[PDB]
Amino acid sequence: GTSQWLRKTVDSAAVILFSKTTCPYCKKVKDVLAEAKIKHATIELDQLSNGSAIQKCLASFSKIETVPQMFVRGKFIGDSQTVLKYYSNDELAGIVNESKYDYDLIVIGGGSGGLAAGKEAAKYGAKTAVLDYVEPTPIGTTWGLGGTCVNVGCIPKKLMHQAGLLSHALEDAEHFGWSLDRSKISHNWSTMVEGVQSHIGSLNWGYKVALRDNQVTYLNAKGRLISPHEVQITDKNQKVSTITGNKIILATGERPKYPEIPGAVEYGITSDDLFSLPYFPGKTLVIGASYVALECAGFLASLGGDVTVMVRSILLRGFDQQMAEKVGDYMENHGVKFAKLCVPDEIKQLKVVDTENNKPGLLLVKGHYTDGKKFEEEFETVIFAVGREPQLSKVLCETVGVKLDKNGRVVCTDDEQTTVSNVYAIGDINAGKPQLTPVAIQAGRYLARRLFAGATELTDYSNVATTVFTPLEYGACGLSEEDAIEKYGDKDIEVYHSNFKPLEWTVAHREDNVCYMKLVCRKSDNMRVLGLHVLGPNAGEITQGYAVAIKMGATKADFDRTIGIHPTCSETFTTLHVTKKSGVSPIVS
Amino acid sequence: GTSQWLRKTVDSAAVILFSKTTCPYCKKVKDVLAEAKIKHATIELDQLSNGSAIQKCLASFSKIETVPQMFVRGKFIGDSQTVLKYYSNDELAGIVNESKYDYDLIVIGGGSGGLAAGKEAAKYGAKTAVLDYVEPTPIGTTWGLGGTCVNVGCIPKKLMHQAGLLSHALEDAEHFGWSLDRSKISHNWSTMVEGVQSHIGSLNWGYKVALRDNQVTYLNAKGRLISPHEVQITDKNQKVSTITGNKIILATGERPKYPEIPGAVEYGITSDDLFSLPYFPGKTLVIGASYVALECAGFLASLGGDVTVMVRSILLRGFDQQMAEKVGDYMENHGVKFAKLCVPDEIKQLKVVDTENNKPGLLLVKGHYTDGKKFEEEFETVIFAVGREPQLSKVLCETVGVKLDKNGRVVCTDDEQTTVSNVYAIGDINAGKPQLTPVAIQAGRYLARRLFAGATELTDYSNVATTVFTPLEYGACGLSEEDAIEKYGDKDIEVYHSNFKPLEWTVAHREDNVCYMKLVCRKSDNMRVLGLHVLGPNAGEITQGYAVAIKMGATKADFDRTIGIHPTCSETFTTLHVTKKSGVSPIVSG
């Protein structure tokens, strides 16, 4: 069962060397290639279970079983003697560039997955193109290379979150003996946005150069797949040309949804517009209850905003709801208001945005609660966070035969492969996968290795940790309590929980018994940890490490036998004893 | 194999119930005991590999193989019919108190290990006493129940560390758009100490109540083992009485050493004195280079102190020295000066401490460098951090026949047992163990279970993670790079490293490529992680989780196959690719 792979590897590899670590002639070929700046895949037969078998099977393609053996785009070019010849003749350099296609890999979308998968392909000799185009938001907002995370996501939102937490640090400082008057300290939104944008601008250029450095051809162009190897590009001048590629990776991501109600698109904004917004939003309504909505509501309120969240049903749908409710209660006792069981019917305009004076406008939101009562209040700014969607109607002609699911997302096999043999899909557009930056990065790299370096390792999308950067952070890894109970049954679920108080909150006179953690375990499987959950400061930092134990199948005994680091929030995970079955209080003393 | 256990368990258990989960009369006995507020051990025979064998073996002690079966201090009390009889007659509270000894357990020392081991013993019906006495420092400083960590260690030092970090928070705030000038903001030492001591006072009281609530007899008394079951106590009035215990746990910990040079004891202080000090130390010398010395130097400097560290040899002896050097370089570019290769010869006094105005005095430190050159500078305050030592009775433990090693520490087996069968030792006095609070707690609890609840689980003292709360924190778990190379050979050691920059430092205009992490792995064992090391903010929070993966034998492949959380410092451990062998640079950029 080796030859299936060898055909797949040889034919799709751009430049590949079948080698050994202990082949003197394999060393000479490697050394030379590096001097000619010729990048390539290297598969070392002496470090594979099936080494013998592959040597004998190469005979099909090369007519010989020796090492080394260099291939270019499916074609055997030779052993060490033949490659050195072409080098001293200078015909080698032009041989490794001979391709049917302009490009070994075209990547449509220069975001988290695209950039990762392009840079990795180029490491193994792939003639690579990244296409990126940021279609503007309704009010005109646009941005540079990087994707959602870099420009309008993880990066700006966490920096603003940090702006938020420093507020409490100013509070905490007086109690820890510092002589500042927190009451006479205000926040300048423009100063903050200047700093955030400055950093994004440098990430934009950083990514431009990363591509240039690794000989990846960046085109600032809308790409459209008109057939399996043809990509139709459209540049800033509307100049429409075609470029050919062997392997196509779709990596186009998603954009914010707007509710289908009058005034939404005209008068309100999304996350896309928030992170470069030139004026303070002022009195703000966030419509939606996802991590984006509460993250944004949280930081706006911490920067002295008047913030209301309108929630259709529940907070953080898809997350453990005990933890979701605790996140919401924190925000509610710390200045964020909620309109529960409420939807928007209409956005009406009272004042237009004053670009002259950097003020926002003024809007009237009409809505209604589930019992039929009316909602009617003024807000300076209205942020929709009611979901994100792909639009491959833009990007793939429906006639190419890439099956999309009911929600517009690409249906892929376990190796990111679409219904077209040479076309792949990664990141937010890959149906069913968790919509996270690190997941788009590991998927994109691991795919590029499989295409261009004969790797077999697939991405593992299971037990992917997360962190919601609400004023009080919520980290998690694996199943919500409710999901564990549905899958294994209540009699098979043991839940260990405890409140805690960060030592930093003691002198600072913050709350006892609001920070909280639990382990959802499975009795019949040695109390296997199915779910880790924590609400407190630096939840991401706390949670991350445990993701490795959970991947490895950590049991409750594994948490117990580990010794804590003192003093930390994290340590309380090493001494949990109170079960939900016991009814004993998780408050601590 | 199993009757050996049953003898050991039944004999040493205070109150124990041989049970099953699906025994209706076992439920009735349990329910009743809980109503009578009678705490006890429960062993469920139907949840053990060896269940059948234990039922048949009870016949030696009880004359029967039924469940349930209740025992008190090695005496069979009865089956369910006999126990429900004794309950309705009210003879039952009587029967569970009968003891040869005043106490099932005396614990000498009410610190991290002692308090943990006493509270746990009482959970399983043990008649328990905790003795705690704080001998005052040379200047007279003293404190409440809780031990070194609570009053003089982890708690006050991290709170002062937090005071330190908020300095940077004030700086970072201006850049994130907040309208304060760091230059017009100073720190009040007394305000800070007031709040820290307030918190310690609440832990002092908290611990006193936790003991009372669990029916543990706290005695504020110097305890002394005069024989294997007899403990001689001496209260604040010098009233010298004796109390008997079945099992004795020594948990007396350590106190600061002073160098044998003139003026050290008279004119200078230690960590014990610092955390309640009524005046800002001002221009300060720390002698020593341990985690205490650099932790204390770091926070003093951050609170506008003029701080110098005198280092005999290297920073953080016993820790990975690449990481130790990087911790020191941070402190050096952030206001801490170092006198390298230097020892103190003399502390001379120029002014006495000004108790009138709560300012310090003034001292002259005379010392010398390893090349022979002189050292002479004025300091307002001089803190010794040159080691801690067991203050254990040095001849008494001999009279009793508890072997101490050459350094004053108790030589124990892997089950915390001393050379006297009924006497145990836990925490910093236990020779060879890591001197850490959570290690003292785990030791104490797991021992109390083994004595009073028939547990067999030992403590695992290996790969116990640490965190040095230097202004830039250093977390670690397992072997230093140099220790791994010495044990396995350099050919077999692969080291993955990378610099990083916290996103929080980007708008804040702090350093690129000073934060640093590495994984020391073993090539011949699937790149098994032998050591994780990290210098950045929240190092303890970062490090903790990985301690569990390493305990379970995490490989590099295990870190790679895990997906990162973005954006965090921790995630950079899920994508390390640069080896030290390759010579490629650790430096990064977005």
Ligand SMILES: Cc1cc2nc3c(=O)[nH]c(=O)nc-3n(C[C@H](O)[C@H](O)[C@H](O)COP(=O)(O)OP(=O)(O)OC[C@H]3O[C@@H](n4cnc5c(N)ncnc54)[C@H](O)[C@@H]3O)c2cc1C
């Ligand atoms: C507000 C917000 C906060 C988030 N916070 C986090 C977080 O903290 N942590 C986390 O892990 N994830 C977070 N995410 C999710 C994360 O941003 C995404 O999972 C990730 O960016 C998606 O990667 P991608 O490459 O699939 O798509 P994207 O990063 O969206 O990249 C797609 C790119 O392709 C462009 N494009 C579209 N069509 C074409 C075309 N035809 N031709 C060329 N280019 C095209 C798009 O405009 C974009 O530049 C957040 C998302 C949002 C919206």
Ligand SMILES: Cc1cc2nc3c(=O)[nH]c(=O)nc-3n(C[C@H](O)[C@H](O)[C@H](O)COP(=O)(O)OP(=O)(O)OC[C@H]3O[C@@H](n4cnc5c(N)ncnc54)[C@H](O)[C@@H]3O)c2cc1C
């Ligand atoms: C400055 C400093 C900072 C530290 N920071 C940390 C940290 O961040 N994290 C960490 O894990 N560890 C830290 N440690 C170490 C930690 O404090 C110790 O490991 C821990 O205190 C050991 O607990 P123990 O029970 O062994 O002894 P202790 O906690 O010291 O308890 C011993 C107690 O017994 C009393 N005693 C002694 N003899 C008698 C007697 N005959 N009768 C009655 N009472 C007696 C003593 O007065 C004392 O109260 C720090 C230590 C210091 C000095």
Ligand SMILES: COc1nc2ccccc2nc1CCC(=O)O
């Ligand atoms: C994820 O989007 C939703 N899925 C649902 C599934 C079942 C029931 C309701 C649901 N509501 C939403 C989005 C609206 C909301 O979150 O209230």
Ligand SMILES: COc1nc2ccccc2nc1CCC(=O)O
């Ligand atoms: C434990 O203290 C020491 N251990 C050593 C071990 C081996 C060699 C030298 C040593 N010097 C010290 C003394 C403190 C110091 O390191 O400066």
Ligand SMILES: [Cl-]
């Ligand atoms: Cl750009």
Ligand SMILES: [Cl-]
């Ligand atoms: Cl609860």
Ligand SMILES: [Cl-]
């Ligand atoms: Cl500084």
Ligand SMILES: [Cl-]
């Ligand atoms: Cl920070």
Ligand SMILES: [K+]
């Ligand atoms: K759009």
Ligand SMILES: [K+]
């Ligand atoms: K706590």
Ligand SMILES: [K+]
């Ligand atoms: K533990």
Ligand SMILES: [K+]
């Ligand atoms: K970084």
